[PDB]
Amino acid sequence: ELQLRPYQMEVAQPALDGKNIIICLPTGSGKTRVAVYITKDHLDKKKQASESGKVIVLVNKVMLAEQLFRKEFNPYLKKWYRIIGLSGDTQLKISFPEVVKSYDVIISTAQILENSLLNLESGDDDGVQLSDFSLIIIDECHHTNKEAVYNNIMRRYLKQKLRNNDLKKQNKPAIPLPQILGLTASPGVGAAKKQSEAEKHILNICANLDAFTIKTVKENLGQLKHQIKEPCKKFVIADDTRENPFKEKLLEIMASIQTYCQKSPMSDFGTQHYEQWAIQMEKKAAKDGNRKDRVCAEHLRKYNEALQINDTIRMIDAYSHLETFYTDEKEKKFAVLNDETDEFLMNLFFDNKKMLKKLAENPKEKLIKLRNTILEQFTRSERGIIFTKTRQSTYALSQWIMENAKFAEVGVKAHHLIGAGHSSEVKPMTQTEQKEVISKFRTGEINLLIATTVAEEGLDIKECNIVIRYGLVTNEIAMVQARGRARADESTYVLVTSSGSGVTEREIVNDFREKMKYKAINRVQNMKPEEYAHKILELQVQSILEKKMKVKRSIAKQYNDNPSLITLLCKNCSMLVCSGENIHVIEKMHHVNMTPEFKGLYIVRENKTNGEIICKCGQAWGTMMVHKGLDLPCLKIRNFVVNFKNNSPKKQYKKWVELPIRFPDLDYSEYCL
RNA sequence: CAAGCCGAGGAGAU
RNA sequence: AUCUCCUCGGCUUG
Ligand SMILES: Nc1ncnc2c1ncn2[C@@H]1O[C@H](COP(=O)(O)OP(=O)(O)O)[C@@H](O)[C@H]1O
Ligand code: ALF
Ligand SMILES: [Zn+2]
C-alpha cells in the first residue's frame, strides 16, 4: 500500500539509479516516505540483480529511530523484508555486527555504527565495515560538520573513495563503495555574512557526503507551495522597566561585596562577562591558594546567575535557588563542625533572606505578556509548544500555568519536557518518560508542551497550532527547524524577547540567512558537473588531511603517564589531600584514595544513595562509590588543585583525561583481610 | 532508580 | 589557537 507524490518522485528520480546524492525539502513533505520508497526500490533492484541488498539508516536523535521504525519503515516494508530498530535504549543481545547480516534493513543511531567500526579497527570485536552495506542513508545531514559523528563516518568513506580512485589509474581491482543518500531540510550555513561563503559551506557539506547534487524540486514546486503552509511570523517584545525594587536590593548587595573584596567588574551586572571574570578570579585564587578571592568570586557568580534568570524568570525562583544554595552551605559547615569570610557572606545573605522572600511575592514583565499571548491563542483555537534555553525555565512555565487561574479557566493542558541525562540541578527525564509525555500531547491529554533543543529536530506531529519561543535565539537552523514543527494547516510562529538585547537582531539575521540559502543553492544547482567535481574533490581531500593532522597532534598529546609526580590539594584550603601514588583506578574510569591515612581527612554527608564527601573546611570533594562491596571513596578532580614536585605551577583541569600522567589499576589483593 | 567516564554541536567571551 | 554556559550520543558501576 506504498504511495508516492509527484515531487517526491522527481526529487528522488536520480537516486533511483546510482547518484549518491542529497535531498532538500521543507519539513513534513514525505522525506521519510521518500526514503522508504527508495529503500524498497533499491532492495528490489538488488534482488533482481541477484546481488545482496543491505540498507542502513542513521539518525542523530535516539527518539527518531523509534519514530521511523514505528510509523514509516516497519509498516510498509515489513512483509517484503526483515526490519529492525536499534538505539541506546535497546539491548543488542545478539550484537551489532551479526544483525548487520540478519535483518537486512537496519535502523540505528550513528554512534553505534561508529563504535562497531572503531572496535573493528581495534580488533577487539569482529566489528563491521562499510562494504557490508550497499546503501547508507542519513537524516539531518546538516550535522555533517568539522567533527560531527556523521562526518567521522563519511571521512572513512571518503578515504576509501580516494583509494579506489588511486586504483583506477593503477590497478583494475577495487573495493566497493555503498551508495550514500542524504535527507535534510536546511543544509544550513556556517554563520557567513557573505553568500559566497555560504555557497562554499554548502559545497563543503556536499563534499562531506559525496553529493553530486542537492537536487531540489522545481516543476511540481507550486503544488508543494499550495500543500504546505508557513506560519505567520509574530514578534513580541517586553521591557523589564519594573522589578526595580527587588533586583536593585540584590544589586546593592553585590556592590557591597565587590567592595568587600575589591572586586573590579570592568563590566555590568547581568551578563556572561561578569560570570567569566568571576571564574578567572577563581582560577587566580586557586593559583594563589588564597581565600576571599575565589570563594567571594564564586558567590558573586551565583548572584549574577540569579540576576540573569531574573531577567526572564520570576524572582521567587532565584530566591529558591539561593535559598537551597546557602541551605547546603550551612549544612556542610555544621556537618564539618559536628571564618570571617563565610560568616560575613552567610550573615549578609540571611539578614535579607526573609525580607527578600517577602519582596518576591510582589508583582512587577515578559512573563505576563507571554501568558496573555498563550491565553489568547488558545481561545482562538477553542495544542501548543514552547521553546526556551533552560529546563528550569520549562518547569517554571509549567508552575506558572498550574498556579495561574486564567489558564485553568481556558482549560488548556500543559506539561514540561526536558532532555535525558542529568544537567546539574534538574531531575533527569527518561527516554520512556519522554515518549509518554509526547503521546500525552499527541493524544490531546497535553495541550501545551515545553521543551528544549531536543524538540527542535524531528518530533514529527500531524498538526500543532501554536509555536512560541521565549527568549531563545542561537542560529537560523534552530529557528527554522523549530518553525517546521508547527505542522498545522493554519500555523502561527512567535518569538518573544527583550528589546534591549540584540535578540530580535539575531532573529532578523536568521531570516536573511534563510534567504541566502536559496540564493546559494540556486547558484550551485546550476553549476558545471566538472567544476562541481573539482570543488568537491578538493574539499574532501582537505577534510581528510585535516583529520589526519588532528589525529597526529592527538597522538603526540598524551605520552607522559607519570606514576607519581604531584600532590593534590583542596582548593578552598590549599591543604594536602593526596599524593601522586596513593591513588588508584577502577573501571579504567574512576580514581580513589584508600590508605586510610587519607581517611583521617574527609567527611561525609547524605540527604534527600552514594553519599557525598566534603572537606575539613566544607569544600565538596566527591562520592562514596559502591564497587564490589568496597565503599571506595571516589573524588572529582574538578574540585581539587595540583602541585607538581618541581617549581609548583598550580594548575587545574576539571577532567582527569586532561592530565597525561597515568595512575594504576587497583589490585584487591592489597585489601584482603 | 542512582552515580560516574568520554566524544560532539551550538550560544557567549579571549 | 583558547575559556565559560545549554543540548545530543555513547560507555561503565551500583
Ligand atoms: N505518498 C504520500 N502522499 C501524501 N502524503 C504523504 C506521502 N508520503 C508522506 N506523506 C506525508 O508526509 C508526512 C511525513 O513527512 P516527513 O518527510 O516524515 O517529515 P520531514 O520531511 O519533516 O522529515 C506525513 O505526515 C504524510 O502525511
Ligand atoms: F526530515 Al524533517 F522535519 F524535514 F524531520
Ligand atoms: Zn579544604
XYZ file of C-alpha atoms (C1' of nucleotides) and ligand atoms in Angstrom:
734
model
C 0.000 0.000 0.000
C 3.005 2.236 -0.539
C 2.306 5.657 -2.018
C 4.300 8.463 -3.585
C 3.772 12.041 -4.687
C 4.910 13.718 -7.910
C 7.583 16.000 -6.500
C 8.768 13.117 -4.346
C 9.405 11.010 -7.432
C 11.014 13.966 -9.172
C 13.457 14.766 -6.399
C 14.472 11.157 -5.878
C 14.486 10.227 -9.549
C 18.301 10.382 -9.864
C 18.939 8.273 -6.795
C 16.531 5.612 -8.022
C 19.607 4.591 -10.017
C 23.036 5.384 -8.668
C 23.650 9.043 -7.917
C 24.665 9.111 -4.288
C 23.053 12.458 -3.555
C 21.270 14.745 -1.112
C 17.672 15.868 -0.869
C 16.473 19.232 0.440
C 12.797 19.908 1.069
C 10.764 21.688 3.740
C 9.545 19.754 6.735
C 6.735 17.225 6.655
C 6.961 16.655 2.908
C 7.252 12.865 2.897
C 11.022 12.734 3.243
C 10.624 9.605 5.309
C 8.248 8.230 2.702
C 10.775 9.148 0.032
C 13.378 7.195 1.916
C 11.086 4.214 2.337
C 10.243 4.128 -1.350
C 13.924 4.320 -2.185
C 14.762 1.536 0.239
C 12.172 -0.778 -1.246
C 13.188 0.075 -4.791
C 16.873 -0.325 -4.027
C 16.463 -3.754 -2.452
C 14.132 -4.974 -5.177
C 16.769 -3.885 -7.665
C 19.432 -5.825 -5.788
C 17.274 -8.946 -5.746
C 16.585 -8.747 -9.468
C 20.352 -8.348 -9.868
C 20.998 -11.475 -7.784
C 23.010 -9.167 -5.536
C 22.971 -8.737 -1.774
C 20.689 -5.989 -0.537
C 21.722 -4.278 2.691
C 20.485 -0.899 3.871
C 21.068 1.133 6.978
C 19.613 4.295 8.417
C 21.275 6.816 10.677
C 19.609 9.273 12.970
C 21.225 11.639 15.383
C 18.453 11.517 17.927
C 17.522 8.365 19.738
C 13.827 9.191 19.647
C 13.926 9.373 15.881
C 14.920 5.760 15.345
C 11.854 4.561 17.191
C 9.650 7.061 15.377
C 10.776 5.953 11.920
C 10.606 2.267 12.777
C 7.160 2.637 14.330
C 5.306 4.694 11.793
C 7.032 4.595 8.400
C 9.609 1.901 7.685
C 8.374 -1.180 9.518
C 4.733 -0.861 8.388
C 5.333 -0.707 4.652
C 8.359 -2.967 4.259
C 7.610 -5.482 6.999
C 6.129 -8.050 4.619
C 8.796 -7.750 1.937
C 11.975 -7.544 4.019
C 13.142 -8.006 7.569
C 13.367 -4.795 9.563
C 14.834 -3.906 12.928
C 15.410 -0.834 15.041
C 18.288 -0.092 17.402
C 19.261 2.602 19.875
C 20.795 3.065 23.291
C 17.576 2.019 24.995
C 17.561 -1.212 23.007
C 19.624 -4.225 24.029
C 21.657 -5.752 21.190
C 21.628 -9.127 22.855
C 22.809 -10.510 19.527
C 25.351 -7.794 18.713
C 25.592 -5.177 16.027
C 27.862 -6.957 13.551
C 25.725 -10.066 13.459
C 22.424 -8.306 12.863
C 24.158 -6.454 10.055
C 23.757 -9.729 8.174
C 20.483 -10.861 9.744
C 17.641 -8.373 9.328
C 18.714 -6.847 6.000
C 17.159 -3.496 6.911
C 18.917 -1.759 9.753
C 17.871 1.346 11.586
C 20.385 2.610 14.073
C 21.744 5.555 15.912
C 25.013 6.781 14.490
C 27.457 6.275 17.311
C 26.522 2.607 17.359
C 27.768 2.073 13.834
C 30.853 4.124 14.539
C 31.541 2.184 17.712
C 31.407 -1.070 15.782
C 33.772 0.261 13.135
C 36.138 1.546 15.779
C 36.126 -1.832 17.505
C 36.910 -3.491 14.189
C 39.876 -1.162 13.875
C 40.974 -2.141 17.367
C 40.291 -5.788 16.531
C 38.715 -6.289 19.956
C 35.455 -7.227 18.213
C 34.735 -8.531 14.742
C 33.005 -5.271 14.075
C 31.766 -4.151 10.691
C 32.897 -2.441 7.503
C 31.214 -0.134 5.038
C 31.453 -2.814 2.375
C 28.961 -4.862 4.349
C 26.286 -2.325 3.455
C 25.036 -1.462 -0.007
C 23.173 1.769 0.717
C 23.816 4.172 3.580
C 21.025 6.599 4.333
C 21.130 9.635 6.573
C 18.816 12.151 8.139
C 19.532 15.689 9.208
C 22.627 15.780 7.030
C 23.241 19.336 8.195
C 25.040 17.992 11.234
C 27.796 16.835 8.980
C 30.418 19.223 10.293
C 34.002 19.560 11.341
C 33.996 16.806 13.961
C 30.438 15.609 13.927
C 29.574 11.954 14.150
C 28.301 11.542 10.623
C 31.421 13.291 9.435
C 33.641 10.741 11.125
C 31.906 8.031 9.157
C 31.986 9.952 5.920
C 35.651 10.658 6.434
C 36.241 6.921 6.348
C 34.061 6.588 3.276
C 35.866 9.412 1.523
C 39.240 7.919 2.313
C 38.160 4.680 0.703
C 36.860 6.508 -2.350
C 40.210 8.211 -2.747
C 41.891 4.807 -2.569
C 39.539 3.464 -5.220
C 40.299 6.477 -7.389
C 44.008 5.788 -6.940
C 43.484 2.179 -8.017
C 41.511 3.420 -11.020
C 44.762 4.515 -12.672
C 46.960 1.814 -11.097
C 45.085 -1.487 -10.899
C 41.697 -2.693 -12.059
C 40.788 -4.292 -8.682
C 38.778 -2.011 -6.419
C 36.748 -2.125 -3.224
C 33.007 -1.412 -3.451
C 31.568 1.761 -2.015
C 27.950 1.871 -0.854
C 25.639 4.403 -2.369
C 25.088 7.286 0.021
C 21.834 9.179 0.330
C 21.108 12.362 2.201
C 17.916 13.769 3.635
C 17.503 17.160 5.257
C 15.563 20.403 5.152
C 18.121 23.149 5.791
C 21.709 22.276 4.918
C 22.348 25.442 6.871
C 25.226 27.890 6.870
C 28.308 28.429 8.963
C 27.302 31.912 10.070
C 28.511 33.502 6.845
C 27.863 37.205 6.387
C 28.626 36.726 2.688
C 26.632 34.446 0.441
C 29.794 33.360 -1.342
C 30.960 31.954 1.973
C 27.586 30.268 2.350
C 27.759 28.595 -1.032
C 31.215 27.437 -0.046
C 29.696 25.993 3.116
C 27.141 24.148 1.030
C 29.803 22.743 -1.245
C 31.678 21.603 1.840
C 28.591 19.745 3.011
C 28.118 18.076 -0.345
C 31.742 17.001 -0.406
C 31.329 15.588 3.068
C 28.522 13.497 1.586
C 29.623 12.733 -1.983
C 26.508 14.524 -3.096
C 26.909 15.238 -6.817
C 23.822 17.427 -6.353
C 21.361 18.942 -3.949
C 18.510 18.251 -6.363
C 15.552 20.254 -5.104
C 12.189 20.343 -6.909
C 11.140 22.962 -9.448
C 8.235 21.686 -11.548
C 5.692 20.464 -9.009
C 7.022 23.264 -6.815
C 3.718 25.104 -6.947
C 1.785 22.041 -5.826
C 4.024 21.936 -2.766
C 3.679 25.640 -2.027
C -0.063 25.018 -2.017
C 0.306 21.833 0.023
C 2.455 23.328 2.776
C 1.555 26.444 4.742
C 4.001 28.685 6.541
C 3.076 30.005 10.000
C 2.613 33.735 10.304
C 5.624 35.380 11.924
C 4.997 37.326 15.121
C 7.389 39.496 17.126
C 6.732 40.009 20.839
C 8.794 42.452 22.887
C 8.608 43.225 26.600
C 10.920 45.562 28.513
C 11.765 44.985 32.177
C 11.079 48.520 33.345
C 9.549 47.084 36.532
C 11.196 44.666 39.032
C 13.453 47.540 40.132
C 12.679 47.091 43.864
C 13.747 43.517 44.356
C 16.511 43.283 41.780
C 18.080 46.538 42.900
C 18.231 45.366 46.511
C 20.228 42.381 45.310
C 22.423 44.529 43.082
C 23.280 46.673 46.083
C 24.317 43.534 47.933
C 26.570 42.678 45.008
C 28.197 46.094 45.145
C 28.701 45.735 48.887
C 30.547 42.500 48.223
C 32.694 43.653 45.316
C 33.812 46.396 47.680
C 34.154 43.783 50.416
C 36.936 42.208 48.369
C 37.996 44.931 45.938
C 36.328 43.187 43.014
C 36.569 45.367 39.912
C 33.906 44.144 37.464
C 35.168 46.042 34.418
C 31.665 45.335 33.102
C 27.986 45.364 34.025
C 25.826 43.024 36.083
C 23.518 40.570 34.349
C 25.696 39.054 31.652
C 28.356 36.431 30.963
C 31.361 38.750 31.010
C 30.834 39.211 34.726
C 30.488 35.474 35.219
C 33.612 34.756 33.237
C 35.756 37.257 35.102
C 34.425 35.716 38.303
C 35.680 32.346 37.124
C 39.043 33.789 36.135
C 39.240 35.256 39.633
C 38.584 31.762 40.952
C 41.404 30.481 38.747
C 43.801 33.124 40.025
C 42.920 32.488 43.664
C 43.492 28.762 43.296
C 46.823 29.580 41.678
C 47.254 31.595 44.886
C 45.557 29.156 47.221
C 44.065 32.289 48.763
C 40.588 32.656 50.203
C 38.202 35.615 49.960
C 39.100 35.694 46.263
C 37.814 32.530 44.612
C 35.119 31.995 47.244
C 33.800 35.536 47.035
C 34.070 35.377 43.255
C 32.010 32.192 43.268
C 29.328 33.690 45.488
C 29.150 36.724 43.229
C 28.847 34.360 40.281
C 25.889 32.695 41.975
C 24.304 36.095 42.488
C 24.853 37.059 38.854
C 23.235 33.815 37.774
C 20.271 34.663 39.977
C 20.042 38.051 38.297
C 20.300 36.621 34.809
C 17.433 34.237 35.498
C 15.524 37.174 36.940
C 15.860 38.764 33.511
C 13.402 36.168 32.219
C 12.053 34.424 35.319
C 10.004 35.107 38.422
C 12.288 36.263 41.216
C 10.843 33.645 43.565
C 12.736 31.017 41.609
C 16.039 32.818 42.149
C 15.267 33.134 45.849
C 14.581 29.408 45.993
C 17.794 28.851 44.047
C 19.956 30.705 46.540
C 17.896 29.504 49.496
C 18.768 25.922 48.644
C 22.339 27.019 47.938
C 23.012 28.580 51.327
C 20.974 25.846 52.967
C 23.549 23.366 51.706
C 26.358 25.701 52.744
C 25.170 25.820 56.350
C 24.588 22.072 56.379
C 28.121 21.482 55.108
C 29.711 23.676 57.741
C 27.683 22.196 60.594
C 28.457 18.647 59.490
C 32.136 19.623 59.442
C 31.960 21.064 62.954
C 29.850 18.160 64.259
C 35.802 32.007 59.180
C 35.169 35.742 58.982
C 34.777 35.490 55.206
C 32.000 32.909 55.147
C 30.476 34.374 58.296
C 30.237 37.750 56.585
C 28.788 36.189 53.456
C 26.210 33.894 55.032
C 25.051 36.528 57.505
C 24.967 39.114 54.725
C 22.557 36.796 52.933
C 20.371 35.611 55.791
C 19.988 39.190 57.008
C 17.892 39.814 53.885
C 16.709 36.251 53.267
C 13.260 36.531 54.827
C 12.794 40.160 53.796
C 13.626 39.391 50.184
C 11.321 36.388 50.459
C 8.534 38.831 51.287
C 9.595 41.055 48.391
C 9.477 38.127 45.987
C 5.687 37.942 46.324
C 5.163 41.431 44.889
C 4.129 41.702 41.220
C 6.116 43.841 38.774
C 7.004 41.720 32.632
C 7.765 39.386 29.737
C 6.085 36.564 31.653
C 2.801 38.452 31.765
C 2.916 39.204 28.056
C 3.615 35.539 27.364
C 0.643 34.458 29.459
C -1.564 36.880 27.554
C -0.451 35.597 24.166
C -0.884 31.976 25.181
C -4.348 32.511 26.594
C -5.487 34.491 23.582
C -4.204 31.981 21.059
C -5.733 29.036 22.899
C -9.094 30.785 22.974
C -8.632 31.380 19.247
C -8.115 27.621 18.855
C -11.173 26.970 21.030
C -2.027 22.067 21.038
C 0.865 24.323 21.985
C 4.652 24.313 22.038
C 7.183 26.426 23.902
C 10.938 26.542 23.401
C 13.480 28.263 25.630
C 17.002 27.863 26.943
C 16.903 26.013 30.228
C 14.965 23.076 31.589
C 14.414 25.099 34.747
C 12.610 27.626 32.577
C 10.266 24.923 31.312
C 9.460 23.874 34.869
C 8.793 27.468 35.888
C 6.425 27.902 32.958
C 4.608 24.727 33.958
C 4.249 26.028 37.510
C 3.087 29.387 36.181
C 0.398 27.635 34.169
C -0.536 25.418 37.108
C -0.945 28.315 39.533
C -2.461 30.902 37.201
C -6.236 30.541 37.326
C -6.788 32.079 33.885
C -5.179 29.074 32.215
C -7.436 26.790 34.238
C -10.367 28.925 33.089
C -9.294 28.326 29.495
C -8.877 24.633 30.241
C -5.632 24.317 28.276
C -3.500 21.342 29.286
C 0.221 21.725 29.885
C 3.307 19.808 30.986
C 7.057 20.297 30.761
C 9.515 18.116 28.896
C 13.300 18.188 29.125
C 16.233 16.246 27.792
C 17.515 12.937 29.061
C 20.660 12.963 31.135
C 21.396 14.854 34.328
C 22.250 18.550 33.969
C 23.169 19.561 37.488
C 20.088 20.842 39.384
C 17.435 19.224 37.225
C 15.876 15.811 37.664
C 16.914 13.929 34.518
C 13.972 12.769 32.461
C 13.675 9.312 30.953
C 13.538 8.356 27.302
C 10.478 6.300 28.153
C 9.050 9.270 30.022
C 9.753 11.485 27.028
C 7.715 9.106 24.885
C 4.946 9.155 27.465
C 4.659 12.927 27.611
C 4.887 13.162 23.835
C 1.996 10.763 23.345
C 0.026 12.547 26.068
C 0.414 15.595 23.857
C -0.404 13.610 20.719
C -3.470 12.146 22.444
C -4.740 15.601 23.344
C -4.085 14.906 27.023
C -1.446 17.647 26.920
C -2.212 20.837 25.006
C 0.874 22.956 25.781
C 4.282 21.298 25.647
C 7.508 22.780 26.998
C 10.819 21.654 25.548
C 14.473 22.401 24.849
C 16.601 21.974 21.721
C 15.850 18.255 21.598
C 12.336 19.002 20.399
C 13.516 21.327 17.630
C 14.667 18.449 15.416
C 12.394 15.701 14.183
C 9.485 15.140 16.553
C 7.058 14.855 13.672
C 3.498 15.842 14.593
C 0.477 15.940 12.305
C -0.676 19.408 13.348
C 0.438 21.813 16.057
C -1.497 25.036 16.427
C 0.873 27.253 18.414
C 4.633 27.641 18.490
C 6.104 30.185 20.888
C 9.770 30.776 21.564
C 10.662 32.514 24.822
C 13.925 34.429 24.777
C 15.672 31.820 22.652
C 17.839 32.536 19.611
C 21.024 30.668 18.675
C 21.264 30.080 14.923
C 18.985 30.084 11.916
C 18.967 26.302 11.623
C 17.489 26.020 15.100
C 14.845 28.645 14.384
C 13.792 27.257 11.015
C 13.564 23.679 12.246
C 11.562 24.938 15.204
C 9.184 26.659 12.796
C 8.881 23.406 10.874
C 7.286 21.614 13.811
C 4.215 23.870 13.642
C 2.845 21.351 11.119
C -0.745 22.667 11.227
C -2.676 23.773 8.156
C -3.118 27.078 9.987
C 0.061 27.671 11.968
C 1.472 30.577 13.945
C 5.088 31.345 14.816
C 6.028 33.674 17.660
C 9.246 34.993 19.149
C 9.398 36.775 22.499
C 12.360 38.667 23.923
C 13.574 41.909 25.449
C 14.017 44.916 23.205
C 17.285 45.922 24.861
C 19.154 42.845 23.697
C 20.018 42.122 20.071
C 17.862 39.034 20.171
C 15.468 40.491 17.613
C 18.518 41.418 15.565
C 19.591 37.774 15.631
C 16.104 36.766 14.516
C 16.423 39.116 11.560
C 19.808 37.554 10.837
C 18.291 34.114 10.589
C 15.672 35.480 8.221
C 18.400 36.889 5.983
C 20.268 33.604 6.340
C 17.237 31.699 5.090
C 17.149 33.935 2.035
C 20.851 33.454 1.424
C 20.437 29.679 1.494
C 18.269 29.666 -1.607
C 20.456 32.370 -3.112
C 23.357 29.928 -2.960
C 21.514 26.702 -3.675
C 20.280 28.068 -6.977
C 23.859 29.149 -7.679
C 25.168 25.616 -7.253
C 22.354 23.562 -8.759
C 23.178 25.477 -11.942
C 26.860 24.580 -11.835
C 29.183 22.610 -14.071
C 29.426 18.909 -13.185
C 33.171 19.033 -13.835
C 33.744 22.150 -11.742
C 31.455 20.602 -9.149
C 33.639 17.502 -9.077
C 36.788 19.595 -8.739
C 35.457 21.623 -5.817
C 34.042 18.571 -4.061
C 37.237 16.580 -4.540
C 39.294 19.429 -3.126
C 37.009 19.760 -0.114
C 37.080 16.027 0.569
C 40.865 15.994 0.327
C 41.119 18.974 2.649
C 38.854 17.354 5.223
C 40.805 14.105 5.182
C 44.118 15.939 5.552
C 42.695 17.919 8.454
C 41.555 14.739 10.176
C 44.988 13.168 9.734
C 46.619 16.260 11.215
C 44.230 16.244 14.157
C 44.961 12.571 14.789
C 48.716 13.134 14.777
C 48.527 16.039 17.217
C 46.267 13.980 19.472
C 48.699 11.053 19.402
C 51.583 13.299 20.435
C 49.247 14.802 23.050
C 49.249 12.141 25.791
C 52.632 10.474 26.269
C 53.757 11.144 29.858
C 51.767 8.687 32.001
C 53.776 9.542 35.074
C 53.041 7.426 38.152
C 53.534 9.918 40.962
C 54.921 13.397 40.434
C 52.442 15.604 42.243
C 50.313 16.441 45.254
C 46.572 17.064 45.235
C 45.312 19.842 47.493
C 41.919 21.149 48.435
C 41.113 24.286 46.506
C 39.387 26.375 49.154
C 42.075 25.428 51.660
C 45.370 24.652 49.936
C 45.681 21.661 52.249
C 47.337 18.432 51.213
C 44.807 15.769 50.246
C 46.621 13.092 48.234
C 49.889 12.151 46.561
C 50.943 11.050 43.107
C 50.994 7.354 44.012
C 48.467 6.786 46.794
C 45.747 7.000 44.153
C 44.366 4.011 42.286
C 41.965 3.434 39.417
C 38.913 1.278 38.776
C 36.971 0.521 35.615
C 39.802 2.466 33.989
C 37.487 5.397 34.670
C 37.400 6.251 38.335
C 40.040 7.339 40.803
C 40.177 6.677 44.531
C 42.444 7.049 47.551
C 42.430 4.179 50.021
C 45.206 4.036 52.636
C 43.032 5.445 55.424
C 45.828 7.837 56.307
C 43.676 9.682 53.797
C 40.531 8.624 55.667
C 41.603 10.713 58.647
C 40.790 13.728 56.466
C 37.461 13.659 54.707
C 33.893 13.993 55.922
C 30.606 12.519 54.761
C 27.059 13.720 54.203
C 23.835 12.448 52.668
C 20.311 13.839 52.392
C 17.248 13.590 50.175
C 22.411 6.510 47.764
C 26.092 7.111 47.015
C 26.919 9.529 49.795
C 28.817 12.739 49.216
C 32.159 13.856 50.606
C 33.119 17.248 51.993
C 36.280 18.867 53.302
C 37.523 19.929 56.700
C 36.525 23.400 55.515
C 33.249 22.386 53.962
C 34.520 22.003 50.415
C 32.752 19.343 48.372
C 35.054 16.625 47.095
C 33.297 13.575 45.666
C 31.183 10.490 46.287
C 31.445 7.158 48.080
C 31.233 4.678 45.212
C 29.996 1.177 45.986
C 32.221 -1.170 43.984
C 32.498 -4.894 44.698
C 31.393 -4.497 48.294
C 34.085 -1.903 48.847
C 32.847 1.605 49.618
C 35.671 3.206 47.696
C 35.860 6.985 48.180
C 35.909 8.443 44.676
C 36.794 12.094 44.187
C 36.317 14.580 41.358
C 39.409 16.351 40.021
C 37.000 19.192 39.281
C 37.126 20.194 42.943
C 40.834 19.958 43.715
C 44.139 21.539 42.716
C 47.602 20.391 41.682
C 51.171 20.910 42.804
C 53.942 19.283 40.802
C 57.027 18.104 42.625
C 59.150 20.795 40.946
C 58.518 24.533 40.533
C 54.961 24.224 41.931
C 52.999 25.554 38.942
C 49.452 25.436 40.280
C 47.049 24.079 37.670
C 43.527 22.748 37.335
C 41.858 20.628 34.685
C 38.253 19.605 35.502
C 38.957 16.291 33.764
C 41.428 13.545 34.550
C 41.887 12.906 30.843
C 43.319 16.398 30.502
C 46.171 15.136 32.652
C 48.580 12.941 30.637
C 50.150 11.242 33.634
C 48.764 7.822 34.464
C 47.687 6.008 37.622
C 47.480 2.256 38.272
C 44.505 -0.047 38.443
C 43.633 -1.364 41.876
C 44.675 -4.851 42.986
C 42.264 -6.121 45.620
C 44.956 -8.464 46.948
C 46.035 -5.447 48.991
C 42.677 -5.093 50.721
C 42.404 -8.813 51.528
C 41.577 -9.413 55.185
C 16.353 4.373 40.193
C 21.226 6.426 41.390
C 26.264 7.678 40.280
C 30.446 8.219 37.026
C 33.879 8.485 32.115
C 34.327 10.036 27.178
C 33.074 12.329 22.457
C 30.012 16.103 19.715
C 27.308 20.510 18.371
C 25.584 25.398 19.073
C 25.260 30.370 22.234
C 28.904 33.775 24.586
C 33.986 35.668 25.598
C 39.709 35.784 24.613
C 44.680 28.713 18.577
C 41.866 29.133 23.658
C 37.859 29.868 28.108
C 32.718 29.803 30.012
C 27.014 28.481 29.690
C 22.933 24.975 27.185
C 21.847 20.426 24.043
C 22.828 15.194 21.636
C 25.010 10.330 21.753
C 27.634 6.503 23.628
C 30.314 3.722 27.660
C 30.723 1.770 32.645
C 29.149 0.825 38.034
C 25.574 0.277 41.888
N 2.701 9.426 -0.809
C 2.278 10.404 0.030
N 1.152 11.099 -0.233
C 0.706 12.075 0.579
N 1.332 12.441 1.708
C 2.470 11.832 2.095
C 3.020 10.757 1.262
N 4.137 10.342 1.880
C 4.295 11.078 3.009
N 3.294 11.967 3.130
C 3.124 12.944 4.229
O 4.398 13.409 4.688
C 4.431 13.454 6.117
C 5.772 12.959 6.641
O 6.812 13.858 6.272
P 8.332 13.561 6.697
O 9.198 13.588 5.464
O 8.390 12.385 7.638
O 8.626 14.871 7.572
P 10.033 15.618 7.429
O 10.119 15.914 5.955
O 9.872 16.847 8.289
O 11.041 14.618 7.929
C 3.289 12.590 6.620
O 2.567 13.282 7.642
C 2.425 12.296 5.408
O 1.119 12.868 5.543
F 13.209 15.358 7.880
Al 12.245 16.562 8.776
F 11.260 17.760 9.659
F 12.130 17.576 7.313
F 12.366 15.551 10.242
Zn 39.538 22.249 52.265
